Amino acid sequence: TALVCDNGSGLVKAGFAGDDAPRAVFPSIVGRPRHQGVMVQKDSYVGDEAQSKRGILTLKYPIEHGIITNWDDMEKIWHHTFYNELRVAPEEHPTLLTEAPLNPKANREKMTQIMFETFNVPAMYVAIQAVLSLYASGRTTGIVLDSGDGVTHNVPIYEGYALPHAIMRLDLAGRDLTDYLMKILTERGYSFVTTAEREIVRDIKEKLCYVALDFENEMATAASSSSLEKSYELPDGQVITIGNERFRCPETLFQPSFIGMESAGIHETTYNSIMKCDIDIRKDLYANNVMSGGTTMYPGIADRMQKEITALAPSTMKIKIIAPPERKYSVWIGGSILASLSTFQQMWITKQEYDEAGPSIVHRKCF
Amino acid sequence: TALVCDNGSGLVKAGFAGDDAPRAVFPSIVGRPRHQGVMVQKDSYVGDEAQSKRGILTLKYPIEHGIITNWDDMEKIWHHTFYNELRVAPEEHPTLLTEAPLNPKANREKMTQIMFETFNVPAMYVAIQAVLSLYASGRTTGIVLDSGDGVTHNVPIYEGYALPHAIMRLDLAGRDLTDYLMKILTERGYSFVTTAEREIVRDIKEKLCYVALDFENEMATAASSSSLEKSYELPDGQVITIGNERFRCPETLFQPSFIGMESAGIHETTYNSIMKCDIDIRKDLYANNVMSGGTTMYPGIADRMQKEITALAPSTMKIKIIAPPERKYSVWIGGSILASLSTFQQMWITKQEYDEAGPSIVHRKCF
Amino acid sequence: TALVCDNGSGLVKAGFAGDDAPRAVFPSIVGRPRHQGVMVQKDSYVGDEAQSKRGILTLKYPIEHGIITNWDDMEKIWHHTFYNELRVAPEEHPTLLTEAPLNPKANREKMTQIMFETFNVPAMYVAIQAVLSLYASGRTTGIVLDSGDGVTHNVPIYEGYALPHAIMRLDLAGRDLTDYLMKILTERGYSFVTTAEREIVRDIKEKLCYVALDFENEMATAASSSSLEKSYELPDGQVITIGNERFRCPETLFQPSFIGMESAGIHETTYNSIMKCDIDIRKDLYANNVMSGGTTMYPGIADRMQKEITALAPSTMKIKIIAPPERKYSVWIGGSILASLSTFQQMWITKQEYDEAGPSIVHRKCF
Amino acid sequence: TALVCDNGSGLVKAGFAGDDAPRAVFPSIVGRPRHQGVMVQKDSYVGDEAQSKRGILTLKYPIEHGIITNWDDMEKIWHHTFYNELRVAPEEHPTLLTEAPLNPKANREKMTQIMFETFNVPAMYVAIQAVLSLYASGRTTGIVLDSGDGVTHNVPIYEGYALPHAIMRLDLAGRDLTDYLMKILTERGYSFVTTAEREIVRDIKEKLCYVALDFENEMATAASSSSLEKSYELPDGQVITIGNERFRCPETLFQPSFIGMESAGIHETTYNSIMKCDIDIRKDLYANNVMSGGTTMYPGIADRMQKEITALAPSTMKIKIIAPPERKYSVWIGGSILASLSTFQQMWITKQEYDEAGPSIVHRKCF
Amino acid sequence: TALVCDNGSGLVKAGFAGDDAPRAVFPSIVGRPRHQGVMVQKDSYVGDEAQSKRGILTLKYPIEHGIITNWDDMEKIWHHTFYNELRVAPEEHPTLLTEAPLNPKANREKMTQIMFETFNVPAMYVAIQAVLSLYASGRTTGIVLDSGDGVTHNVPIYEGYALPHAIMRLDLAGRDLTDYLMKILTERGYSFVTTAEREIVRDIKEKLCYVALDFENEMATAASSSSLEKSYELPDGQVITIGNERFRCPETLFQPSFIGMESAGIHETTYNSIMKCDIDIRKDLYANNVMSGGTTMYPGIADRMQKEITALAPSTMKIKIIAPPERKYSVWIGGSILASLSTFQQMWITKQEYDEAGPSIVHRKCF
Ligand SMILES: Nc1ncnc2c1ncn2[C@@H]1O[C@H](COP(=O)(O)OP(=O)(O)O)[C@@H](O)[C@H]1O
Ligand SMILES: Nc1ncnc2c1ncn2[C@@H]1O[C@H](COP(=O)(O)OP(=O)(O)O)[C@@H](O)[C@H]1O
Ligand SMILES: Nc1ncnc2c1ncn2[C@@H]1O[C@H](COP(=O)(O)OP(=O)(O)O)[C@@H](O)[C@H]1O
Ligand SMILES: Nc1ncnc2c1ncn2[C@@H]1O[C@H](COP(=O)(O)OP(=O)(O)O)[C@@H](O)[C@H]1O
Ligand SMILES: Nc1ncnc2c1ncn2[C@@H]1O[C@H](COP(=O)(O)OP(=O)(O)O)[C@@H](O)[C@H]1O
Ligand SMILES: [Ca+2]
Ligand SMILES: [Ca+2]
Ligand SMILES: [Ca+2]
Ligand SMILES: [Ca+2]
Ligand SMILES: [Ca+2]
């Protein structure tokens, strides 16, 4: 059976092809002790173990904005995934990996070299995340908006054909929203600075943040009463209360100037991607906006996207946002479907054709 | 076998590693005759012999506030410990010594030079007292409050890692409480002035003093009736009676302004040490307050610490004070466990590496 | 004429706009008697009077890390500043106040409410300290590194435009270095514990501490000879000698792990702030590193910053550290220039627009 | 007008507030006949009358070491003071009384009960003797060394604030020196045994004893020649000659081991009191050593104290001993100043607040 | 062999060291003829010869109250002791002499000068009588009450250390009791006036006097019946009868006011000496009251001392009076033990060190 490993900037989603859910979901973090040991303990911790000991660790993400920046730490995470989480021998399982579009070419070349020389997989494949999200929705046409921890990207697909010139990629996703929430939480006197405290702010974001339908009207409501304020208990028992920060943090997705970026929000980027496509397919793309990734899980984000794109598109077009309840795992679920197709069993990069072409084989066999 | 010698400001606790109790416990005192001998007697007396002849001696503690101030007298005490109490040859026993944190560096350097050049030990090691107390409790996480005769100090440890920036040290312990009891005993007309009479007041403190749960409510009870008053027979048959002095003396631990100190009490110091630690480990520290040392042996001190820290900590935190019945010997018991570990046998400072680095070897091998 | 009051965590710098130096510079401290008065004396002392009577006082800083934590004590300091130091009526002087960036919003709201309701100023304004430092240097472009007693912060400014997303703030400044010096002075047997003795250590720091160009090479020099050791006479005539503590204390600015912080040093933070800025302005920022505040007054800190940033920046960039000799008062001097500009006279928050908008007016009129 | 009564162990100093000298100075003695009356005389004699009839009386001091041990005899002395010496009605005069610090609490409680119930004073107050000595010197800062007939005590005061934890009390004063002189006078064959003869030795002490600057060098001078020997005529015409006894008797103040005491001399005790004070006030205490009491009236004691403290203090400190010529009455003179202050008229313990609180009112109204 | 000469006020006890009893015991008297010789006899008689011819002699004691008042007569007694009683050459025997404590310094200086220049002893030593009594009892701890013919003195010794400040000396002993018995014998009409008749009264005292357990109850018994009356035959055959004089004479030891002295009795003096000692040794002193000297030989004096001290001491203390049957010679027996110790042979004052230091050598070599 094939292995499906979705190495996100934030989480590792790993499992076996054919299943309906990832078997192993854990943070893509490596932690190392920052204090001195006095009781006569490992050199580093990975995943959930690093998350539970984060009080005495410095946490490092080896993947930033979909790009692997620390290959020694990324090998620790893959090793932890295969041997400790899946408890499997990689030498007998074809491994399907994922990647954001418009990534550096050396990224997937080094992924290929490590899978074939360090883990000795029989075959591997690198798919594009947004394409897998369309497999999970059971569609062959649609513009996918995938937003994870590192990258937000749009990929328009029509009848199984990608329009690569219309692919959009924005280096603004969950981790940037977490950093922004940390910044605006200082307005109320709350100081989160360490990498461990960043994990606390991320949990605050996932529980209390939501997308306002009308941002300026929501800002007036939060300034007139405390009906929007909610409380959250920190790990040490302290209770913090946040008001408009709940919807100001996800508003960065629609107004990237909040964090100093010049790019347009995800609604304009989606519309700009559709407008780069041929005029005869735009109507089908307007009706099949597929959202995937953890950053699309904010309450109200589908209604806001619906409202924003409707204002940009012609009035006669039917705008439909497809937001499945399980869209946090759409990339893995789509990869599980793809790796189980009988038509896909010819698409694997085998060890034989890697030995005669080097790691550059991945560029002429994977989109 | 290894020797474990806990040189406290008040008592010497010495024994062999692997045992469950110190073999030799005696006062860390040197006494010299202050009168003229007329019957044709030693130049000085050490330990229990000085305590039994204290009527004609001036008693001197060579260790004050965990710092050895008289090295000639300290050598007499170590000599008495090895040859008279343990009856052992130090040249064939690795010796584990203890020290309070944040001590002067010359203190443990001169300890190393004396052990290697005067007693010619094969190896030695200087541990921190609070760390050894955590070994004795069988824990790897907790904030240790060790209070002996000289020093009260807090050391937070999480998963075997010390947080040195959160270590607190207060030069207020048993000997300061004894001096304060001597002062407030003059309110009833009892005058203790000599060093021998200070030993009598110390015995009064250990037998009659206790910690009040509510100090101001206890002061009103002692002022309304004599139900709190207790009697004590002096060595010469005189009987003294003390009332609120029983709980006013240990109250100095929680209100150091009684003796003119500006520092906060041991409850606030414990809380300040926890608040200096990372927020993700505070909950485990709140549940693992370990008390050790003779000054934590007052009846009611665990209930008072529980009450005081609960008022400082958030209401959802579970405050648990660990006060073992044998906590007066926790430092020695922990040192006996550490010196018996197979993983510790590489941590000794051997005579070979001392001959090539001098006494400064102790700073890069001992915490 | 306008009043310029720079309320630092450590010092109050106050004076009149148009002058070239603050008229009143005194410690931002409130002292209260901790002993019992027996001679038939005020309830509290402020500023220089508290510093001269500190032997019998407990000293409190109302501002910690640029945040006012005791508003009753802060009102005493402002009252002392206006009526006793400047000897002025605040009801007839617009008051320019300063603040660190990324402060809690309630801080400058309560500053506005006190200035308008307690002191009844006609107008006020809250400026950012680093921006004022750029006014003092006569520049419109540069990255300001301001480090006082409470906060170290970087603000990059290009052609008069701030890049707020690149603003960095580190809660590590002079007071943390003083606390660290107090800790490592115990290595030589010197014990400073009281708030009054902390003022002695601060004076030791300002006179003997310096920044080593190469820290590890300086540590080897101090360990081989006593050429680096210097003496200092305490107020009671005792003489202390310190060696490597002279440069170990300021080294915390470049290695915050000395005090248990995870953040990067001030050189990496400066470089990270420049790298967050647009690529077209980085060359001008590299050539205009402006240092201000008392914590940048260590001998050798400009040469060390020059060396550290040069190692981080590309080799073709010209790194220039601007360290004026009067940079301890740059914030006040810049505020004196700003409050005297004819273009600034429209920027004041007047009492009229405060009466119709409440203290929240300060957020939409002050950066 | 207020009455100022300084009840010393040796002398009663009584007078009216506002005066510059006590009106009544007489010995605090009660004498009773020890022989049989044959001529057909009182039951007891008080003060100067007991001193003139001491040949046929047994003399008793009701105050020993500042503690009233015979309350029936002490009432006789107070009665003699009010009605026979001052010739006044105590029911119309507030009475200021004095006491040594660290006295039993029952001492000043019974003083309060007798003044309010036996003599029916309208108001009373119990001051500390050393504090009054500082009033007499016109100072608000200084360490007072008061040594009378019963108690030697040090009280450091800074800016009107006492440091109670630094108060030192030594039960070694004039009466112990008299007893020691009686003992060493037997070396020359002179035998004084009765209580009446003790009064003769006291007069010898006050006339011939002095403090040697260098004791061992003075002992060699007295052993080589008779230049130090002086004569004294006893009441019966016999002439005695004393040599080194002149300076051996006051040397007990600096070497209390002469009379079997373990405590340090008055110079070390003064230095130990200063060293218990905060480091920032020690320089002012070194320059303001105030001496008071009859036992500081030995010729050369200020030069000896100056020499001894200079050897203990750092070389850069300026040691200044303040020894007024009228320092034998400093306690009374200071009490006369205090009782005449307009600010003190609220400090009296009135009869009204004594009737509602009992004699325990004196503890919460008097230091 | 060494000579041990105990020169008491009443008797000379002389012998050789190592023996268990003095070889020569005779009265310390010199008699001279007071009538005219008519038969054609010495100029003076010494010792037993003076006692047998006392009818025609005037008897003189050269020692009064332990002080040699007639040095020409004392030389006659020493000459009689060496040549007539011991029949020995003093030039070949080290001589141990005794003395009461608190004696004039010239007394033992002139003893040293006479022994070295008149008798030319090779070495000599002056011991304290009470210390020798403790040697005789085989103890190293105890308070010795030695009462001879001239002096009653208490010396507390603990573990071989004397407490000189607690030494008590009372110039009331056997000779004062003899004089008092002579006075109260006139109540019955018996007149003894001459020095020879004083020797008769002394013999009456030694045979008939005893100490009453309860004095006032014994006085009532003697006044109701004649059961206490005893008879005594004078040398001329006359028979005298005495009643309450038997116990009134020794009662002066417990009530010195009988002879006009102000001092306390021997029981209070013993208790006052113990109370001057450190509190930790009082229990051992209470259990080791050693009595010595001829004046402690009255029947019932140990039971009376036991009863009197028990009433003064705390009820939990065990009072034990050690009264050996041979305690009349305890000083000599102890001196015989001391002079025979091998450790004492370095303590002698030799003729060599006397020739270089003069008679003042005795003060820095003898206690
Ligand atoms: N309920 C939620 N609301 C908002 N954000 C969420 C929620 N759940 C997860 N996220 C965010 O989604 C991001 C990563 O999710 P995921 O789609 O797995 O991306 P990746 O594949 O990069 O790990 C994280 O930054 C996380 O904060
Ligand atoms: N039962 C008790 N109650 C109160 N204090 C005690 C008790 N037992 C011992 N102590 C105090 O503990 C102090 C020293 O104990 P210890 O922990 O051995 O410290 P150290 O290691 O410094 O000798 C002494 O000052 C003693 O007075
Ligand atoms: N010469 C110096 N060397 C090192 N530090 C100094 C020097 N002078 C002042 N400082 C430090 O600067 C800090 C505060 O200076 P300042 O810039 O006025 O800050 P603030 O505005 O917070 O008062 C103090 O902590 C002080 O110790
Ligand atoms: N000139 C002097 N020299 C030495 N001692 C003196 C002199 N005058 C008085 N004294 C001593 O001072 C003591 C008491 O003086 P005082 O200060 O009045 O004390 P108190 O208040 O206890 O009576 C007496 O013991 C006396 O012997
Ligand atoms: N049995 C006795 N009862 C009472 N007193 C006695 C007795 N025997 C001797 N004494 C008295 O003891 C005194 C001297 O005895 P001793 O101890 O030898 O003293 P010293 O050494 O002064 O001669 C004499 O005064 C004598 O009266
Ligand atoms: Ca993803
Ligand atoms: Ca200890
Ligand atoms: Ca500042
Ligand atoms: Ca006095
Ligand atoms: Ca005798």
From Swiss-Prot, chains A, B, C, D, E:
<feature type="modified residue" description="Tele-methylhistidine">
    <location>
        <position position="65"/>
    </location>
</feature>
<feature type="region of interest" description="Interaction with alpha-actinin">
    <location>
        <begin position="350"/>
        <end position="362"/>
    </location>
</feature>
<dbReference type="GO" id="GO:0003785">
    <property type="term" value="F:actin monomer binding"/>
</dbReference>
<dbReference type="GO" id="GO:0005737">
    <property type="term" value="C:cytoplasm"/>
</dbReference>
<dbReference type="GO" id="GO:0032432">
    <property type="term" value="C:actin filament bundle"/>
</dbReference>
<comment type="function">
    <text>Actins are highly conserved proteins that are involved in various types of cell motility and are ubiquitously expressed in all eukaryotic cells.</text>
</comment>
<dbReference type="GO" id="GO:0032036">
    <property type="term" value="F:myosin heavy chain binding"/>
</dbReference>
<keyword id="KW-0067">ATP-binding</keyword>
<feature type="modified residue" description="ADP-ribosylarginine; by SpvB">
    <location>
        <position position="169"/>
    </location>
</feature>
<keyword id="KW-0206">Cytoskeleton</keyword>
<dbReference type="GO" id="GO:0044297">
    <property type="term" value="C:cell body"/>
</dbReference>
<keyword id="KW-0558">Oxidation</keyword>
<dbReference type="GO" id="GO:0030027">
    <property type="term" value="C:lamellipodium"/>
</dbReference>
<dbReference type="GO" id="GO:0005509">
    <property type="term" value="F:calcium ion binding"/>
</dbReference>
<dbReference type="InterPro" id="IPR043129">
    <property type="entry name" value="ATPase_NBD"/>
</dbReference>
<keyword id="KW-0547">Nucleotide-binding</keyword>
<keyword id="KW-0013">ADP-ribosylation</keyword>
<dbReference type="GO" id="GO:0019904">
    <property type="term" value="F:protein domain specific binding"/>
</dbReference>
<dbReference type="InterPro" id="IPR004001">
    <property type="entry name" value="Actin_CS"/>
</dbReference>
<dbReference type="GO" id="GO:0031941">
    <property type="term" value="C:filamentous actin"/>
</dbReference>
<dbReference type="GO" id="GO:0005865">
    <property type="term" value="C:striated muscle thin filament"/>
</dbReference>
<dbReference type="GO" id="GO:0090131">
    <property type="term" value="P:mesenchyme migration"/>
</dbReference>
<dbReference type="GO" id="GO:0030240">
    <property type="term" value="P:skeletal muscle thin filament assembly"/>
</dbReference>
<dbReference type="InterPro" id="IPR020902">
    <property type="entry name" value="Actin/actin-like_CS"/>
</dbReference>
<keyword id="KW-0007">Acetylation</keyword>
<feature type="modified residue" description="Methionine (R)-sulfoxide">
    <location>
        <position position="39"/>
    </location>
</feature>
<dbReference type="Pfam" id="PF00022">
    <property type="entry name" value="Actin"/>
</dbReference>
<dbReference type="GO" id="GO:0048306">
    <property type="term" value="F:calcium-dependent protein binding"/>
</dbReference>
<keyword id="KW-0963">Cytoplasm</keyword>
<protein>
    <recommendedName>
        <fullName>Actin, alpha skeletal muscle</fullName>
        <ecNumber>3.6.4.-</ecNumber>
    </recommendedName>
</protein>
<dbReference type="GO" id="GO:0030175">
    <property type="term" value="C:filopodium"/>
</dbReference>
<dbReference type="GO" id="GO:0030041">
    <property type="term" value="P:actin filament polymerization"/>
</dbReference>
<dbReference type="GO" id="GO:0031013">
    <property type="term" value="F:troponin I binding"/>
</dbReference>
<feature type="modified residue" description="N6-methyllysine">
    <location>
        <position position="76"/>
    </location>
</feature>
<keyword id="KW-0378">Hydrolase</keyword>
<dbReference type="GO" id="GO:0031432">
    <property type="term" value="F:titin binding"/>
</dbReference>
<dbReference type="GO" id="GO:0005884">
    <property type="term" value="C:actin filament"/>
</dbReference>
<dbReference type="GO" id="GO:0005524">
    <property type="term" value="F:ATP binding"/>
</dbReference>
<dbReference type="GO" id="GO:0051017">
    <property type="term" value="P:actin filament bundle assembly"/>
</dbReference>
<dbReference type="GO" id="GO:0005523">
    <property type="term" value="F:tropomyosin binding"/>
</dbReference>
<keyword id="KW-0488">Methylation</keyword>
<dbReference type="GO" id="GO:0010628">
    <property type="term" value="P:positive regulation of gene expression"/>
</dbReference>
